[PDB]
Ligand binder design. Structure first.
Ligand SMILES: O=C(COc1ccc(F)cc1)c1ccc(O)c(O)c1O
Ligand SMILES: O=C(COc1ccc(F)cc1)c1ccc(O)c(O)c1O
Ligand SMILES: O=C(COc1ccc(F)cc1)c1ccc(O)c(O)c1O
Ligand SMILES: [Mn+2]
Ligand SMILES: [Mn+2]
Length: 181
């Protein structure tokens, strides 16, 4: 069977705003999407999941991810000043105005409990909430609190399955999956 190009896949199957933000992110961190095309796909996937999570309840969440870094920190600092939330040590992905906390979103094909533990060990807050999605449909979240309802989460998971399925039909999945870390 033909083995497609990952860059072609990303440009065809992700919305143009997502793709532009992903390109800008990669440039900001000094990386060529032409040699790190699996990473380009992972950044787009993660960004899309952040946007879908926010869209599940419009205006409940401020989006942090996808902004250039200096701008992201000014937003985080503003939120902390306004709401009195504790300032995080690493940029998180969202702020939840309802539960009054920052959220870190993970997207993985590794074992979700291990990935969760590595995230929690990395960020070292008892405040920031972590929500992990696997392409298997599995998920794991801080204190078994999943934040959104089952159908919002099912929409995210279905999008992940769709990405996985389209990658596989293009021969792109095996390499993408192996590229993690
Ligand atoms: O981190 C990644 C890929 O991240 C993923 C994250 C979740 C997945 F299911 C698959 C891949 C990555 C891929 C290619 C590369 O060159 C690189 O430097 C990366 O960090
Ligand atoms: O793309 C990301 C996060 O944003 C990034 C932004 C720039 C990079 F060089 C690397 C990652 C990503 C984050 C968590 C995750 O679980 C995942 O699969 C990701 O692709
Ligand atoms: O952006 C990164 C890695 O690069 C960073 C750059 C600055 C930070 F304060 C934190 C991370 C990142 C990796 C995994 C992930 O899930 C995520 O949301 C990220 O932003
Ligand atoms: Mn992030
Ligand atoms: Mn994240």
């Amino acid at each position: 069977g033909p083995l497609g190009s990952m860059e072609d896949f990303v440009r065809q199957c992700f919305n143009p705003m997502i793709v532009e933000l992903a390109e800008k992110t990669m440039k900001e961190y000094g990386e060529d999407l032409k040699i790190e095309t699996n990473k380009f796909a992972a950044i787009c996937t993660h960004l899309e999941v952040c946007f879908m999570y926010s869209d599940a309840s419009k205006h409940r969440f401020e989006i942090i991810e996808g902004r250039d870094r200096t701008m992201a920190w000014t937003v985080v600092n503003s939120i902390c000043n306004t709401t009195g939330a504790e300032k995080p040590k690493f940029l998180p992905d969202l702020y939840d105005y309802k539960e009054n906390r920052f959220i870190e979103i993970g997207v993985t094909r590794r074992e979700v409990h291990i990935y969760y533990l590595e995230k929690a060990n990395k960020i070292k807050s008892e405040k920031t909430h972590i929500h992990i999605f696997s392409f298997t449909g599995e998920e794991m979240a801080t204190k078994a609190d999943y934040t959104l309802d089952e159908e919002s989460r099912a929409r995210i998971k279905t999008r992940l399955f769709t990405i996985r399925q389209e990658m596989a039909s293009r021969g792109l999945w095996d390499s993408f999956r192996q590229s993690e870390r």
